[PDB]
Design a protein around this ligand. Structure first.
Ligand code: PMP
Ligand code: PMP
Ligand code: NA
Ligand code: NA
Ligand code: NA
Ligand code: NA
Lengths: 424, 424
């Protein structure tokens, strides 16, 4: 496939933007080559600057469950923009979206909108610390909640669970209050609670991991997570990716979780920047202007984003069948991928939950981040480029979940399987 | 003025959103009363849910220098949205906006877009630490750069310059690497540099303060700031509010600053969420995917925001006369405010730079944050509500800069002065 115009844009972009991109992964470093510059999308398809059409499995990383440019969503944004792009004051739209969130998450009383997942998780952790008065927070390996300095940590090689800076520019002082545990390791979690559960303000986690590729929580891991609540620890379900996707009520609904706080985003904004943190009133009332935990956002609750999100959530709430459709299409893609890869004699493990799926190139099962790191990234490159050259746009990294949208059809899955049979 | 519908919305909002708002100041706590729910804007005017029209001096806190719903800006957004709301991949629009930023800021080589000012400053400080390898950063009293935990600090009462948490949920560990100095205190700054300039990674500051009301930097303070550069300290000009406003090249152009990094926002997005951090290549190349300083943003560089910002910056670059117009209108408002307040025998100090203005109710001059805190907030309430009841929407806090837009006219200023003559 030729993409001379994207090549020219990438070379030019590098002269004005670090690495030519606004976010690392978009640079294709993990797979090599030049990333296509996307300029248009419709349903499950996207077009690059050279006119090449691709079946899109990235879908802007999660917000597009209804597909690219859904007519109803765009109509709502069109109407809203005519009145003005921003006001910096209360809006009826914010109240409407907050109520929708509360319908999806019954345990929630109050919702605070912010501009990004990074801001949502940063605020939620601060809120947990403020509410409990405790200093420590727990995060799991392979999970990503944004780039707040205290979260840019990795496990240290010694007996301490304190994290160590995983990025330059992050002082040890900012990393020492974050404990790093292994995902799907209930024994390790129960042990940390026994050691110092009473000084941990919160445990944040992706209900179904996507940022290390898909990792599904075991029944016992979920049990241990809720056991932390007895220690006074606040459970924070980071549903920025799973929210409104695995079900209307996200992973919380699907898995029957009982979190103290939930962070939301992506689908929440229907394609435009929007995120939030929410929970019961006794915790949320600590947030300014009600309480001492400070958090602000000048352009938060943007009219267009609220409108796009409202139109999106209304459609999902109006069509519960969309989730069953995604589950069936996802089941077909998973079975198909296993069949094709088995026929090719390639080592593989396909993890999927609803519309989120990842192909790991290593013998199964893949349960922890350690397991995930065993994936053969060289084989992934072959898998990735084989698909891209045949008009199929998959996440440019093995440590990412691919996404299905209601716009994807059975024939799209079949074309994907066929492309693989010929590529590998 | 009656606003029964906004009253109903505010009561309902409080049931679903903390304090009924997405950002503290919008709750009117500093002035009392119910905040009007704004639903439409055009030029220098806005309308609330009850149909009341107001001359707008808030202008969504800075992005609307061209006024509400500028036709050319909306047209660009309309065109862009039809192609899709987000892609999560490189876009020609990002490259275009980055180039525009580089025209406004000649010293810049690379620009990285993020979703909010909070993310921009958080990233820039991390970048400075990564580049220098130093742990400490300096911020000034009254200056606000976002709610990153390390910035949520206030001066301590003792001899240490280390900040102390000013919000609940912020551990002492996160506050101890931020030094808090007084704005416009060159002697204090020179002293800190002598004490430990070699372990300070950066000094961040608002070139012209707005978040404590308008504070103008003295020639000597600006001199001391640049003197820090000789110590290896990176100078970070936070131009989220002043950028593209005081001049096309912001305060950097107006005051002839020589920063190492600049943070941008508000006007940069033309009304939609968008921000950035930028500087020369030797520093910016430390950012991922080029370097070890990590920062990401899934929905950064949103198509609609890039389009709105591009249309906005093109107009400003095409019309240098807009800045002279704002200066003249601002001069008229400042002179008028002094005249009216002097006639009323009220203590006052009016600070202004271009289109940014604040009325402090205390005898002048107001140079430091300490000076600013002397303002009579009770009198401000009278000033605020007197204006609001007469259709003039001023920032609902004395510690805020009011904004003029190219859409404001001489007659609007006169109506403001008249409203005050009758209100006070
Ligand atoms: C679960 C989760 N939380 C937070 C984020 C960060 O979202 P954002 O980049 O808009 O801050 C992401 C995106 N990788 C995510 O997947
Ligand atoms: C100079 C400056 N920097 C950063 C910010 C924060 O912008 P945001 O709320 O979009 O993160 C503000 C808004 N008060 C600001 O005035
Ligand atoms: Na360790
Ligand atoms: Na990842
Ligand atoms: Na002190
Ligand atoms: Na302020």
């Amino acid at each position: 496939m030729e993409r001379p115009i994207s090549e020219a844009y990438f070379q030019e972009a590098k002269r004005h933007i670090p690495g030519g991109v606004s976010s690392p992964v978009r640079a294709f470093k993990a797979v090599g080559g030049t990333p296509p510059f996307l300029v248009r999308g419709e349903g499950a398809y996207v077009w690059d600057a050279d006119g090449n059409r691709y079946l899109d499995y990235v879908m802007s990383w999660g917000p597009l469950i209804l597909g690219h440019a859904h007519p109803k969503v765009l109509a709502r944004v069109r109407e809203t923009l005519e009145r003005g792009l921003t006001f910096g004051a209360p809006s009826p739209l914010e109240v409407a979206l907050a109520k929708k969130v509360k319908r999806a998450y019954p345990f929630v009383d109050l919702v605070r909108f912010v501009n990004s997942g990074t801001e949502a998780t940063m605020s939620a952790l601060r809120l947990a610390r403020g509410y409990t008065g405790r200093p420590y927070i727990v995060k799991f390996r392979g999970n990503y909640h944004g780039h707040a300095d205290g979260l840019l940590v990795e496990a240290g090689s010694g007996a301490l669970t304190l994290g160590v800076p995983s990025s330059a520019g992050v002082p040890e002082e900012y990393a020492k209050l974050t404990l790093v545990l292994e995902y799907n390791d209930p024994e390790g979690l129960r042990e940390v609670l026994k050691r110092r559960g009473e000084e941990i303000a919160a445990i944040i986690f992706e209900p179904v991991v996507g940022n290390a590729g898909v990792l599904v929580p075991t029944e016992d891991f979920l049990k241990a997570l809720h056991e932390a609540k007895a220690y006074g620890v606040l459970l924070i379900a980071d549903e920025v990716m799973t929210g409104f996707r695995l079900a209307f009520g996200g992973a919380t609904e699907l898995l029957g979780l009982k979190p103290d706080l939930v962070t939301l985003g992506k689908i929440l904004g229907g394609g435009l920047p929007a995120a939030a943190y929410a929970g019961r009133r006794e915790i949320m009332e600590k947030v300014a202007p009600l309480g001492p935990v400070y958090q602000a956002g000048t352009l938060s609750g943007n009219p267009l984003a609220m409108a796009a999100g409202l139109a999106t959530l209304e459609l999902l709430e109006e069509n519960p069948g969309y989730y069953a459709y995604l589950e069936d299409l996802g089941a077909r893609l998973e079975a198909g991928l296993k069949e094709v890869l088995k026929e090719k004699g390639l080592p593989h493990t396909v993890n999927r939950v609803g519309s989120m799926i990842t192909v790991f190139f290593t013998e199964g099962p893949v349960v922890t981040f350690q397991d995930a790191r065993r994936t053969d990234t060289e084989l992934f490159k072959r898998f990735f480029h084989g698909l891209l050259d045949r008009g199929i746009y998959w996440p440019p990294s093995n440590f990412e979940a691919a996404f299905l949208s209601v716009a994807h059809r059975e024939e799209d899955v079949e074309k994907t399987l066929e492309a693989l049979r010929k590529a590998l």
